[PDB]
């Protein structure tokens, strides 16, 4: 019935897609920051 009706795995897995897909942006934020920061760079 109410097996944990969070299966930390369910949650756990979301989470973990989360972590990951956020690992993966991570660099290109960073480095999109940095572009963003050497790309923009007024006028």
Same mark, same amino acid.
């Given at each position: 019935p109410?097996?944990?009706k969070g =299966? !930390?795995?369910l949650?756990?897995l979301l989470?973990?897609?989360?972590? +990951?897909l #956020? +690992?993966?942006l991570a =660099? &290109? &934020?960073?480095?999109? #920051? &940095?572009?963003?920061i050497? !790309?923009?760079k007024?006028?």
């Amino acid at each position: 019935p109410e097996s944990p009706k969070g =299966p !930390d795995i369910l949650v756990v897995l979301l989470s973990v897609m989360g972590a +990951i897909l #956020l +690992i993966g942006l991570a =660099p &290109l &934020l960073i480095w999109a #920051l &940095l572009i963003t920061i050497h !790309d923009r760079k007024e006028f």
